[PDB]
């Protein structure tokens, strides 16, 4: 086993090496306000991991339009974090964006745990999920040979901004939920008069006293969260290596 | 921090007890030739995790299909489990099939790294993707207050045992992944004579020779696995609070 | 073996969650003058723990007019908690007044050594008496198949109140005691000095120096106690499960 | 503060020293095929301590009756025990007919947790209830001020006994348990399948899946325990300190 | 394979609990200018160490001419040592007036290395002679199955007392001593110097420079020393189990 | 704060170097079936150690009547033990025919805890009982300023040796005990059984069923430790300075 | 500071990824007869690491005839290494023919104290020389900013060659040294008796009897290695960026 | 292994005694605004360590004209040192100008990393390359059978100055890189736009981005390197044996 962060912790603070520059991590992104999901790949050069950058540089502007920066992250130096990029632009034509961390030596590899017994030297796909507060909110691992899902991550985020701002939890699938929809749910709860007066107020719709919800969201908030999932199961009518 | 088991790792070897009678993980389904999904949510009689259980419940017959058991697991007792399930199925209309572990203390979920920062006392959302070998394929850590998307944990499964049978990579949003669509990836030459000898056989589609692929997969597994993103997309025909 | 807090000590300090809100103790009781009974039971929709709940529940004014609080203790949740109360008063009619500490993870039985060898993962039928003072008085261990008798447990703080106030001790069986009856016995004498003026003082009826009584207690003090065991050996006429 | 064996243990082997003579505990009476209550005191010649030993001398043979032992302990030599029983029964008229362990330096009271902080030189008054295979089955601590009530040692005793020989958990103020009177509960399934057999079956009267009971003790057993309590509370018809 | 304090060492500081109350030692003596002899036995109710309390308590008034308190100890309660003492009383129709140390427990034993090969259980048959500075001036350690010479402690307290006052040595067998009779001896010159000094100035009679003495005490003080040894001698004239 | 051997244990083992030779300590007693008495002083030629030798040595046949050898320690070396012994029996004309332990660097001392406050240097003036098994049945302990009585020792050598074949314990002041004078006393029962048995068996004289004795040691071995507190309380006829 | 293996010792057993395969060291050299050079460099996609890598590929044929073959590292991934070979070999026209170590994690690295102050993430330029017992002869250390001499290293092989051959020390600045030209050192006598008989037989040319020599070394050997430094001292004709 | 000072480490600070005084290091070098070269040897009198000598001697003007001090380093005491000296100009006729180190105990040694497997009780032929800010630039270790060539050493010093002077990197071989000639490297840049800015200003000769360079190095400092390496090739007109 390995040692990882945890959801609710403060994100490790460290400086890093990316190929824009060093940066201290969660400052950088917090000091501006923004989200950032960190992403790993296990090297600059692979089939799969060239597949995920090209993912997320497609994505960019959605996740700046939802104030979400992305940085990526190998143990690779900056010098082929350059070539590799330069490569995909001249080659599958599509420019990557945003940084990518080199972590020779697997310093910050280390830090987040992502050197599982997949490989000895190289990173699993993680994904952390970090808000503007610094603190970490969703982690995923993928394994090598399997890319990520994008969208999903853009569904996370989206989500947990839904749900921080209207104070409320967010159903399996939402915003397609098998029983409630695009509704959201009220948090459950933790007293008895507290589970008692939420019945008698007969403010919100209700299954049983922990069970609570209504539809605050926007119907732009719905149509931006259910328009990612679309994406994600729509075939691309022109496929990049064609050209 | 904490600490977790590591993809490529095999499962930590435990007897747990389920609302089903006591089992030995993995062997209980590495016997059966049988991959699970080892799954956790906070507390029982919670709504996201009510939402998650009948997610599961309705998508069981999409795992049984692949070959892949449900178990389920929060700090909660048997006899609450027992309930909770007995309530689904009054309430909502779903009966839960599959079993979840009873972990009071927290002994296997300190064992899988599932206590996050975000509460002392309950596990938050984990997910484990385990083969037919014992050993985990994929970790997935949400939050509190965050229901998961089923749909991509079918997907996950379905690409990795796809993958395994066919010895090839999965490109990030397969089978709608924006350079090869459908295409999967043959595993990059790890050696310059590997490398030319790939060159020489013209056998692949090739952007380099550490980028190569082919479309082996079935069209009936390519559009299952679509089907699940569909499914995802797709706005509920009919709430189930409704009835 | 494993460790438990002891009789005489200061109740261990801690902040627990129950299904009434977040509450410290013992400080919560201290800080109103009210002695506690904390007990704990292995689980939630459980057969026996629902009957001493029942129990409790019926005696709850009892304990009320000795100015004596309950608390429960389990490793299930505050959700589990509340559908469990529900359900005793949907079935049996009988309303659970008092909290009940949610503990998932055994943080606080393991501080009141409460997980035996009995199981692994649920706690015994433990049982600690505090006073108004915040002080552990005494500590009862029922195993998983056993109920507790709750009227032990009334005459148990009502006797160790009267005894506070009275400045006695309290013979066995009391208030039927074998030898002194609803007699209080005043505590022995620790010196040679003390004993001989005792035997000169001739204020009590006394068997030797060591063992002197009088009866200080009020009829209303003794009748009450009496009450309880009464009640313990009484059959009810009416079951519960009848008109469940 | 202290360590005490626990429930379920078997009881901490080791020689002791009475005024009977030196006897093996559990052994001695686990090779008899007896139960056995071993209590403790602080100090002979106490006034509470005589009262108790007193009622467990009359109620001797309830004990013998139910195939149990009694076995005292304090701090003082078998010199102090042989006078002091002499007293009482002198001045008491009442024979002490069981052994008491002198355990001088405190070495058995140590390793029973019978050293509290409200003395650090003499025990409180603990009990422990011990059955015939060396197995601690009840502890109760009782302080220095107040007395043990020794008619519930024995509905504990012969409740136990009867749980175990029938297979079944005691109620709450068995025999006058307020839902179920003298009635006894089958312990509760701990998987679904069995939860749903049982309520199928029809065997039990039944409040719920968990909550089934019958009435398989015997009148004879049941009016013994009731007589437990009903002595308990009878005022004395003439008091042992008169004559 | 014991420890004990030592000869010239401050007696222990501690607390203790005896029949006539708590007390600090060696503090409660050293305040009023009194030595003690703190003396041991196993156990009360045992016929040796009664009559070694017989013995101390007819030379009660021996003891406290000489300005010597005495205080008892076993690990027997306070309630014991009155008890015991009233039996004595009451039988042997001798009052014992000065206290003991109630050591259940095995505390103040275990300080002052009382606990011995011979018993486990019990103290030997200690004696520690302290002066009024609180320091230890002799050790005796007697064994279960044997009483002291009570004389002979009287007759060591009283030469350590004329040796401290008058600044001399005290031969063997003092008052009698075959070589010098009851001469006291002038310490040792340590250097060369003042052993010719002392040669020189024909001040004391003399066997070598290392070996001088003189007849400086008292008659009475003499005579007092001679009766302990009397005393001891004489065959008493009717025994107290006459009556 | 020092360590020192205990009753009932065995004597520490030691081949420890005598003005007679080394020889190895309990077992060359045992091996004769004798008791010994090993007794230190803080130096040679010293005043108080010296009245002591001559004490024992006069004593000496007292103690080889009773079988009990006599074996002597200091810090000093064998060189200085015999030039001592010569000084001696020249100047106050008393040859001491015992062995002294010579135990520069304190080895046998320390193991002995014979090194105390009073003296960082040299021995106090220890007294260990040996019997003919090697154990260790009494400890003395006195100072450098007041030398031993030495027919207590032999008392108490006398007491034990009788104690051990009389199987009885022995009482305060023995001969002379004011309670039972040269009786000897039966160790107390243990149990109840033993103690009712003993009470009603007519057997001894009693006090309490704790409490019995008789008189079963034989006049002259009554004579003999009596003449021993008899010596100890007469004023000596000659004194041995007037001829020295 | 840090930790390196010394001369003298077996080169350290690891396993270890290179571009052509996984081998182990030294044992994959040491099977085949063979000395190594194993050489670092900081990165791949790296200026004065391409000239040297260029210049190792120039002298390979050199190194094979002396029996001694070559492998670099650096922390870069495979796919980095077999990358920078193709460019190599496109836009400079050397095909880089030896093996590099992918060390990602400084696994390597940290147990050959590669790992200096100038960089915490690359290692510097080092050189470890090691002959065909897997036992390190020599080792150079040089900085990130300044390429190695590479004829240096083969005139340190020879050398060393032709002195274990020869049983010779050889001189500085061998084959022009400044006293004895391409003359070889016999070893010194290190006895008197050695240092006199050396002296007697007159065998060698001798300055002193700790400084004999002789010219043992065949005409080919001596021109070889002088034709290495007769290179190192030449302009190039024509310089490679040119074409 | 063993622990070895780093390159970009400051020279570890210590008091060593020389033949030429007491001095402290790197201080009394770093104080005269001095580079120094410390080297080992094995011990005084030994031929292969003579003819080292002989040559750094011959070489002294050159290591003067660029402001670099020599100081050697052996096991032996100073008057060993010194007669050695004395031994050399005699017969060899060479003076040796430059202070050695004593270090009999191998403090100095064991510090410096200069005790390897090859021998325990005499240094290896350590070379230390420190600046003048007293860092360590260079490290070669070469073993006692084979000495070094001095003009290394000087190629060494030269290029790094020339180096920290231009802001530039030396390829391989300079001055004649077979790529580059004489030209020097400019370091690669480390982020995208840097690399970017490089490429579109045109100011320098380019193979890639991360390969550019130019001729900023005078020709007097590329003749002064060239000529170490000729007279490193080239055969002695008369040998200093002949005298």
């Given at each position: 086993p390995g040692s990882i962060p945890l959801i609710g912790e403060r994100f490790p603070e460290m400086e890093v090496t990316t190929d824009h520059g060093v940066i201290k991590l969660p400052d950088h992104y917090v000091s501006q306000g923004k989200w950032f999901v960190l992403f790993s790949h296990?090297?600059?050069?692979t089939p799969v991991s060239t597949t995920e950058f090209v993912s997320f540089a497609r994505r960019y502007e959605d996740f700046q339009r939802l104030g979400v920066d992305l940085i990526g992250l190998s143990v690779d130096s900056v010098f082929s974090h350059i070539k590799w990029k330069e490569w995909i632009e001249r080659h599958?034509?599509?420019?990557?964006?945003f940084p990518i961390i080199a972590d020779p030596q697997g310093t910050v590899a280390r830090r987040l745990g992502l050197?599982?017994?997949?490989?000895?030297?190289h990173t699993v796909r993680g994904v952390f999920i970090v808000d503007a507060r610094g603190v970490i909110r969703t982690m995923l691992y993928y394994p090598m040979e399997l890319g990520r899902l994008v969208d999903e991550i853009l569904r996370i985020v989206k989500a947990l901004k839904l749900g921080d701002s209207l104070k409320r939890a967010v159903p399996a699938?939402?915003?397609?939920?098998?029983?409630?929809?695009e509704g959201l749910i009220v948090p459950?709860?933790?007293t008895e008069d507290q589970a008692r007066a939420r019945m008698e107020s007969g403010q919100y719709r209700c299954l049983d006293w922990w069970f609570c919800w209504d539809t605050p969201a926007s119907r732009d908030d719905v149509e931006e969260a259910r328009r990612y999932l679309r994406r994600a199961a729509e075939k691309p009518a022109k496929l990049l290596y064609e050209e």
């Amino acid at each position: 086993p390995g040692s990882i962060p945890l959801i609710g912790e403060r994100f490790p603070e460290m400086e890093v090496t990316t190929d824009h520059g060093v940066i201290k991590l969660p400052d950088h992104y917090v000091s501006q306000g923004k989200w950032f999901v960190l992403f790993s790949h296990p090297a600059d050069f692979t089939p799969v991991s060239t597949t995920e950058f090209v993912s997320f540089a497609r994505r960019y502007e959605d996740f700046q339009r939802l104030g979400v920066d992305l940085i990526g992250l190998s143990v690779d130096s900056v010098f082929s974090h350059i070539k590799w990029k330069e490569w995909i632009e001249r080659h599958i034509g599509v420019r990557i964006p945003f940084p990518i961390i080199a972590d020779p030596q697997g310093t910050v590899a280390r830090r987040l745990g992502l050197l599982h017994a997949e490989s000895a030297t190289h990173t699993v796909r993680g994904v952390f999920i970090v808000d503007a507060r610094g603190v970490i909110r969703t982690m995923l691992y993928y394994p090598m040979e399997l890319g990520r899902l994008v969208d999903e991550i853009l569904r996370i985020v989206k989500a947990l901004k839904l749900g921080d701002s209207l104070k409320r939890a967010v159903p399996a699938d939402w915003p397609n939920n098998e029983i409630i929809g695009e509704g959201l749910i009220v948090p459950p709860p933790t007293t008895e008069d507290q589970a008692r007066a939420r019945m008698e107020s007969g403010q919100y719709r209700c299954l049983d006293w922990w069970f609570c919800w209504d539809t605050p969201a926007s119907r732009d908030d719905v149509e931006e969260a259910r328009r990612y999932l679309r994406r994600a199961a729509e075939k691309p009518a022109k496929l990049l290596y064609e050209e």
